[PDB]
Amino acid sequence: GVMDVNTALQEVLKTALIHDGLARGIREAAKALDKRQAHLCVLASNCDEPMYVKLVEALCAEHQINLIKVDDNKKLGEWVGLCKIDREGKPRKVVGCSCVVVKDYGKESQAKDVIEEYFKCKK
Amino acid sequence: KKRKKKSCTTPKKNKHKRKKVKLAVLKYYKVDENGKISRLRRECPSDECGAGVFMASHFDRHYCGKCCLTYC
Numbered sequence A: 001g002v003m004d005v006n007t008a009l010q011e012v013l014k015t016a017l018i019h020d021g022l023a024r025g026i027r028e029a030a031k032a033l034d035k036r037q038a039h040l041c042v043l044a045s046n047c048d049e050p051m052y053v054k055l056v057e058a059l060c061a062e063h064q065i066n067l068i069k070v071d072d073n074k075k076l077g078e079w080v081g082l083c084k085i086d087r088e089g090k091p092r093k094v095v096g097c098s099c100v101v102v103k104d105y106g107k108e109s110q111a112k113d114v115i116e117e118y119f120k121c122k123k
Numbered sequence B: 001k002k003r004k005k006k007s008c009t010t011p012k013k014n015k016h017k018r019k020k021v022k023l024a025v026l027k028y029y030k031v032d033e034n035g036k037i038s039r040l041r042r043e044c045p046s047d048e049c050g051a052g053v054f055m056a057s058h059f060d061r062h063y064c065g066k067c068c069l070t071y072c
């Protein structure tokens, strides 16, 4: 592989946006996890709600679903796509996201391969 | 002819304002120290509302807001 581990999530998130397979927010994520249609989850390390973290971690663990940690919620939202692009090209309007669930993968072999390798290395 | 106003009725019929509830997901689940999760709210017996669609714990009934199913 060539792409970095931490920067390889953008392709998957963009393709899930295009193919409409993203559950955004704690309520949608929890509902998808209960429906066990989820494939993987994305968690934001920077947060002020310990109960949020405990609920997401326990839901991921008790549904045998892999979990990923991200630095901050604003970057997570920028990856997710809840932003508007300015004339120059920067996202002045960003709304952060604390938890994301990927319901359908994008049909990309390279993007999925690195994440699967990372999950296998974690196990 | 010209329109007359005649502006007098019940002072103001107010529009319903929806309640703002912060982090409504949390109260559906209870947590033990061991790491267990228990679902406080019942799950509807309907087709679509089966896993994540919880019911309403009214003082004398259970109510699913997605399909209007009601139980005692």
Ligand SMILES: [Zn+2]
Binding pocket: B044, B045, B046, B049, B053, B064, B065, B066, B067, B068, B069
């Ligand atoms: Zn129902």
